[PDB]
Amino acid sequence: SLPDLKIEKLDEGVYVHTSFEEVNGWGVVPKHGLVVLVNAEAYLIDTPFTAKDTEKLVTWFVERGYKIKGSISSHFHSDSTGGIEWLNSRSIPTYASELTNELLKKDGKVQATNSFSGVNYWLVKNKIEVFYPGPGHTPDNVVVWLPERKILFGGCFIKPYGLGNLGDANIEAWPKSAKLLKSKYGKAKLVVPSHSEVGDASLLKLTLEQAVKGLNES
Ligand SMILES: [Zn+2]
Ligand SMILES: [Zn+2]
Incomplete structure (x- = not known):
């Protein structure tokens, strides 16, 4: 019996959603995403693991x-993309990078309806920016920056205490990607990782340090 979907306010117009899945041999692992309010409209930054929790998340705000104006998935893994099928089935616009959709397609998964590429993509102009630091946790990992609040959703790229699941990781590239991310968003007030607690801009340095260490021991 998995813990309930959790939704709580982080800052003005920004909620953290937390969903839980059993995965071996981790036990139950929480996954954090955001819901960002733009007046009376809501955007999902990552989806929960399941249709059911995606539905509960959507219904809470509806x-x-x-x-619900759209969702963006920060990488192809199920902890960011598990609700895309459901959202597509409800005609809610989904977004992922062109590299993320290609990895979904190749793995037999339903793709985001919209895609983008490049270093920077404005999901909402001046409000929700998507940045591609380069390969790290996965080949396609992006992050989401909320310029009005100085909040960075770092997803599964921000790994301040250890890199985590290396299966689809680019350990050779991650230091350079982590270096670029730090230099881009050292102004961040809050950095929201996928699987640990909200922190400040130091998580960027800690991630870079973890990436460097991981590269050296391989
Ligand atoms: Zn992942
Ligand atoms: Zn993850």
């Missing part, structure tokens, strides 16, 4: 008057 029942409070917010129309």
Whole structure:
């Protein structure tokens, strides 16, 4: 019996959603994403693992008057993409990078309806920016920056205490990607990782350090 979907306010117009899946031999692992409010409209930054929790997430905001305008998935893994099928089935616009959709397609998974590429992509102009630091955790990992709040959603790229699942990781590239991310967003007030607690800009340095260490021992 998995823990309940959790939704709580982080800052003005920004909620953290947490969903849980059993994965071996980790036990139960929490996964954090965001919901970002733009007036009376809501954007999902990552989806929960399941249709059911995606539905609960969507319904929570819909029942409070917010129309769901879209979701963005930060990488191809199920902890960021598990709700894309559901959201597509409800005609809610989904977004992923062109590299993320290619990895989904290749793995037999339903793709985001919209895609983008490049270093920077504005999902919402001046409000929600998507940045591609380069390969790290996965080949396609992106991050999401909220310039008005100085909040960076780092997803599974930000790994301040250890790199985590290396299966699809580019250990050779991660230091350079982590270096670029740090230099881009050292101004961040809050950095929100996927599987640990919210922190400040130091998580960027800690991630770089973890990436460097991981490269050296391989
Ligand atoms: Zn992942
Ligand atoms: Zn993850």
